[PDB]
Amino acid sequence: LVCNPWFEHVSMLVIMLNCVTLGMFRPCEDVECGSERCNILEAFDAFIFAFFAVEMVIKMVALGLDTWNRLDFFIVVAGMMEYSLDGHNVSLSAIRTVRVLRPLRAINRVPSMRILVTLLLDTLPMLGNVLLLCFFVFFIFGIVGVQLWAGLLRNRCFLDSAFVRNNNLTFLRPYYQTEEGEENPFICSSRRDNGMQKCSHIPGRRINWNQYYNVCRSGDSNPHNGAINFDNIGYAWIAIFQVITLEGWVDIMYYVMDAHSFYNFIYFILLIIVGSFFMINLCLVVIATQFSETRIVDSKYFSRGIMMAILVNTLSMGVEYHEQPEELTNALEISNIVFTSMFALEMLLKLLACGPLGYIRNPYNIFDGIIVVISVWEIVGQSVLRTFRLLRVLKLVRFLPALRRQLVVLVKTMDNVATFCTLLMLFIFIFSILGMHLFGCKFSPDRKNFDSLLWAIVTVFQILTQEDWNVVLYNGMASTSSWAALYFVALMTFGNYVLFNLLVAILVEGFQRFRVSCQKVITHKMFDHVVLVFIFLNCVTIALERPDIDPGSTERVFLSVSNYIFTAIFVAEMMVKVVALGLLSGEHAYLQSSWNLLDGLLVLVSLVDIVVAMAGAKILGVLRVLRLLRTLRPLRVISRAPGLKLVVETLISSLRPIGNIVLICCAFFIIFGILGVQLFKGKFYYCEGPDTRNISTKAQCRAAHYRWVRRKYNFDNLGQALMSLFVLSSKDGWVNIMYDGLDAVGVDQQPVQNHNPWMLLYFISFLLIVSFFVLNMFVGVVVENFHKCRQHSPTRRSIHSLCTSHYLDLFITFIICVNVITMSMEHYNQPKSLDEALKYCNYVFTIVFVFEAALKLVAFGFRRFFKDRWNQLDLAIVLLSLMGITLEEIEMSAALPINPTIIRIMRVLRIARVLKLLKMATGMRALLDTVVQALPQVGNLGLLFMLLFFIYAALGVELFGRLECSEDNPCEGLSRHATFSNFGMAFLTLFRVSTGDNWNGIMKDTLRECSREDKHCLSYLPALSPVYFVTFVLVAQFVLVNVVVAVLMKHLEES
């Protein structure tokens, strides 16, 4: 019965049988319960539920009155309720959702997956300190958000009530809305605010009604069918949660910049730094520590000949592109024959030298043999075996022992990844079925739908990548209810929790006479400090450059002369140093260090700039190239600051251990790049027009007077494929590239939705494989740091007793906690009754804190009380609170000598009372202290991070400073808020690119061709744009990785 293993094996079979029936659910074909197919499936379910009841009875009888056993009971009890409740039509459908817990029974049946889930549950209790930090971020920013922006996103430009009445016309729509509709609302700034969007910015008619929408007042709905707003703490947390995921966070920012103030970016910068970066990466640090505590053939020249023969053949496959000349196609086929014969000859020579049994004795010769026959089969059989010619690159592993040793290391990591993958596939399946029940056939149909198991799994997988997940959120919120946000919050929170544990698992298994004067000047202690001043001043000059400076303005003269002065200063510095040290003769010569070589090249470029500028000559093309090299001057700061020099040298040395993983990843990119070109070249064209459902070919598009256009990210050649693959790997806009590959039909054919669903394998295989390599690169950097780190008064006494006792602290904690609850009840258009109640509560809290200060003064004495920092903090809040009440009362009275701006700030600043709770949080303070101890390392990397922004911010203004956006030339990433028009705006744009939020949209705007009528075009900008964004994205993320490592190592050593 229970003491035999076969009974469990029977239980496992039935558990798997349920998973099949659950996946067969059809949301809008099974809910009506009409089809015979549904009838048998429910019969199947009834059969299985009967066994699950029997299994309990036998086990209950055999053991009598373990978490997993309790789970078995809970599932059946709920199942019995649903099963027995049949007959009552009230909420019967809403009760069938309990069937999705059944696959959880497979956890206990599989031993390995049982042990893993035990560790996951045992690690949870030690995340309480991080969870407490999460509450502080959400509540501090949640309250600040509501008090600032409550009800502002309902603003719309309305018609005047008198205007519509007196003119006796009501055909106009009440408020201005774009032709698109309410999905692109025009949020205006009220009269009592200074938002960036006013009703005077409405475009004119394209018979002048748009100029009569001149009153800005609250509307009826918020953006996205009411999903995005700050009307109460409940909605402010959804906006804060979406920002922390870095998905569509700029859009939320732009809404409040239009409605409230431009300086609201400070709110979203701190939230991303504090909430997105530190608070999410502290989860990884805490788990990481906790988990740790818990005669001719054999010749070298012959081998080299084959090695280069394979390499040329593999690269020759990348010369394919869309419109190949037929002679080029033939050359590739002739080339295939030559290389095919060469490998065939090789097998013959080796077979004779060792014989068939000797030849088979080595696995690699077997692998090489199989390729030859398939390749020969292809020639004799003259598109299925053309794709298999990509396997020829795998032969290079034999000749690359260093790379071969890395491949086995990665493979050994996949033994413990498989355990987590099995848990994640079960995790995805449960949420895919759960979504089908909640949102099945209700997103009326969007491609991101839960209408079937295939696209429910794809949608759930997409949310885990955090790509357009907010689009799915708004659909779920609008269709069923606003509480549907908990489906996505639990899916993301639980999914990222499991993926951190996979990263930690790999880490732990990884741990297991004039010349005399010059010599004196350069050796002077103040030499670097003096030159560092001039370098800093040059930065101010570079940052003032922008395209809108008039050639004849005074500023242009100021900037132009400063260039002559600065170039003169930095040649003298080089000349003085060169004379002192010598150019290259002596051992201490000038060119014996790279940091000196860099300085010389910058000086050389500056001199050439003067020479060219001195030319009244056809040197316009060369001049623009020199302007780009003038933005690298700020690189001279690194050598002058010893802190920067050390960190910069540390990052370079960190790339050595992961050099081979990068090579394997780069080889992977080319292999998949070539494969994509063969599949998708010439098929990413489409017809662009208002009514295109009737078009099916290029010819019909021309007839309908539409335009036949190509996607920005395509696979027309290996150059275009590599750009597309990088956008996939970054997981920003990777769904749109996938859709194009799914819809591809052929050359000159209109793409059709979901034409080839089998292409999901191509795009989802690249995402997983590239993510695996990037996972092992992070582990490679950490392990290296670990290895190198380890190698290296009768009445007064009674009051004094009370203050010393813990009773006062517990009382204070209660008072602040209730003050926390009352601060969350504020919302837009709250009743006046609640206003008075909240105001009265403020009086009680202020009085309590005043008594709190008085008693401590009595107990400890004036100076001794003041010594404690916490006591100082207590005084500030009491003092701060007293002024807030005073300004509130006087303003509420007849006299009005105060600005409603000051009253708002004092109202907002009462959020500081939460800091009194930080005193009780001893565990949280220790967690914060770990970061505070890493500042010397994190501080220097921050300077490198801010230097990286300066160089690319100044380089962006030069390249993309003149791009325009208009209805004639629409743009997808750039807007009124995202531009490179000046250094100040380029800095904000790169911060968005740093977080990866629709950075692929910005790149598109730089790849789109120049107008035939416009001037100041740059013909090869499309070639330079991919380099600009690719390098910044890789470099910006790598620096942040080294910040995470610096904190991680300190937390390990600190224990």
Ligand SMILES: CCCCCCCCCCCCCCC(=O)OC[C@H](COP(=O)(O)OCCN)OC(=O)CCCCCCCCCCCCCC
């Ligand atoms: C650390 C704190 C938690 C962080 C988790 C972040 C994600 C939070 C998302 C949960 C909030 C979802 C509810 C949003 C809300 O309050 O407003 C919706 C609701 C209106 O719903 P209708 O669609 O019917 O609107 C039509 C109106 N006739 O608004 C309300 O009625 C307000 C009731 C709730 C007040 C806000 C407090 C909610 C408590 C949230 C706790 C969630 C914890 C999750 C960890």
Ligand SMILES: CC(C)CCC[C@@H](C)[C@H]1CC[C@H]2[C@@H]3CC=C4C[C@@H](OC(=O)CCC(=O)O)CC[C@]4(C)[C@H]3CC[C@]12C
């Ligand atoms: C060494 C660096 C880090 C010093 C600090 C950076 C400054 C040089 C930046 C920060 C703010 C920037 C300013 C922000 C806004 C403007 C307004 C704008 O000037 C205009 O002509 C107004 C717009 C218009 O013409 O309609 C663009 C330049 C300027 C002065 C920017 C010039 C460069 C500034 C001063």
Ligand SMILES: CC(C)CCC[C@@H](C)[C@H]1CC[C@H]2[C@@H]3CC=C4C[C@@H](OC(=O)CCC(=O)O)CC[C@]4(C)[C@H]3CC[C@]12C
């Ligand atoms: C080779 C690996 C190791 C490194 C990556 C190098 C790539 C960036 C190179 C290799 C092959 C190159 C391609 C070789 C041939 C062509 C065809 C050439 O065709 C045309 O000019 C298009 C004519 C037309 O169809 O109208 C355009 C450049 C392109 C795609 C090249 C772009 C740059 C590529 C992809």
Ligand SMILES: CC(C)CCC[C@@H](C)[C@H]1CC[C@H]2[C@@H]3CC=C4C[C@@H](OC(=O)CCC(=O)O)CC[C@]4(C)[C@H]3CC[C@]12C
């Ligand atoms: C390997 C990963 C990390 C990506 C590395 C950066 C690539 C995205 C860069 C490197 C070289 C770039 C290419 C260099 C030259 C050009 C110019 C131009 O080439 C063409 O002529 C193709 C278009 C045509 O057929 O007209 C268009 C962009 C392209 C292919 C670039 C596209 C982006 C590329 C592939």
Ligand SMILES: CC(C)CCC[C@@H](C)[C@H]1CC[C@H]2[C@@H]3CC=C4C[C@@H](OC(=O)CCC(=O)O)CC[C@]4(C)[C@H]3CC[C@]12C
């Ligand atoms: C302290 C933390 C753990 C939150 C829980 C405390 C509750 C006592 C507070 C938090 C937010 C408050 C809500 C904030 C906003 C609103 C909306 C307000 O107006 C509406 O019903 C608006 C309906 C809509 O437009 O969706 C009614 C009171 C209510 C539910 C409040 C009731 C009291 C709530 C739930």
Ligand SMILES: N#Cc1ccc(Cn2ccc(NC(=O)Cc3ccc(C4(C(F)(F)F)CC4)cc3)n2)nc1
């Ligand atoms: N100032 C500033 C600033 C602040 C925040 C932002 C946006 N951002 C948030 C986070 C972030 N990067 C990082 O955490 C660095 C990192 C990248 C990948 C990993 C992985 C995995 F865990 F992901 F798999 C193991 C491979 C770990 C660490 N960037 N941008 C600029």
Ligand SMILES: [Ca+2]
């Ligand atoms: Ca995105």
